Amino acid sequence: KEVTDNNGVKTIANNLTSTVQVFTDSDYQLPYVLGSAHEGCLPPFPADVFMIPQYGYLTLNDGSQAVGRSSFYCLEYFPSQMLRTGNNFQFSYEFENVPFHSSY
Amino acid sequence: LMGGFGMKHPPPQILIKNTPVPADPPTAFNKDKLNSFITQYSTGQVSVEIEWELQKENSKRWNPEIQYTSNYYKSNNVEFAVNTEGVYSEPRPIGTRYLTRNL
C-alpha cells in the first residue's frame, strides 16, 4: 500500500507492481537475534494483527567505540526472493535431534 | 590446558638407540657383564608428513577482516629469517585467531 499525506489528510492506495523481498538465513551467517526472548512475536490470539519487529544486531565494542574485530553485515548482500501480490513464499525445516523436554 | 588436540591414542613414541658394540673381551671367561664399549654415534634423516583437515571461512561479513602481516617498515633484519651469523630466530609468537565468527 502507498500512503500520501497532504494537508493532513491521507489516502492509502494499492501498489500492484511493488515488491516485498524475504529470505531465510539457512547458513546462520547473520547474528542470531531470536533466542534472546525479545518482543514482536505472533500474537497469542489468532484474530490479532501484529507489526513485524525491526532487525538489528550488536558487535564488539570498547565503550561506545568500535573494535577492529567488529563486523558489519549488509543484509542486501544475501540472495532473497522478491514477491509481488500473487507470489507466495514457503520453506521447510527439520529440527535436529533434541532430548524430550520432561513435563513431569 | 596448554593447547592442542587431546587424544586417548596420540601418535606413538618413536624410540631410537644405536646398538652396543663392545671392545675386545678378555681371553679368560668372566661372569661379569662387559662395561667397555666403542664410542659411537649415528646420523640420518627424518621425514614427517602430516595430513591436515581444513574448515574454510564462510563469512558473510562486509568490512575487511584483521589478518596477520609483516609490518613493512625497514629494519636491520628480516623477521623469521636468518641472522648475519647464521642464526634463525622467530621474533614474536603467532596466535591462530584472526578471522572472526558470530557468537
Experimental method: cryo-EM
- DSSP states of A23-52: ---SS--S---GGG--S-PPPSSTT---PP
**Contacts of residue A31 in chain B, CB cutoff 8 Å?**
102
Residues A23, A79: Cα–Cα separation, whole Å: 7
By Cβ distance, the residue of B58, B60, B66 closest to A73 is B60
Phi, psi (degrees; rounded to nearest 5) at B38: -85, 130
List chain A residues with CB under 8 Å of B60: 29-30, 73, 77-78
- Grid coordinates belonging to B88: 634463525
Other C-beta atoms closer than 10 Å to the C-beta of A73 total 19
Q: What nine digits make up the cell of B5?
A: 588436540
Residues of B in contact with A30 (CB under 8 A): 60, 102
Declared resolution, Å: 2.7
- Do the Cβ atoms of B60 and A68 come within 8 Å? no
Cα separation values, A1 from A21, A40, A53, A61, Å? 15, 22, 19, 39
Do A29 and B59 meet the contact criterion of CB atoms below 8 Å apart?
Answer: yes
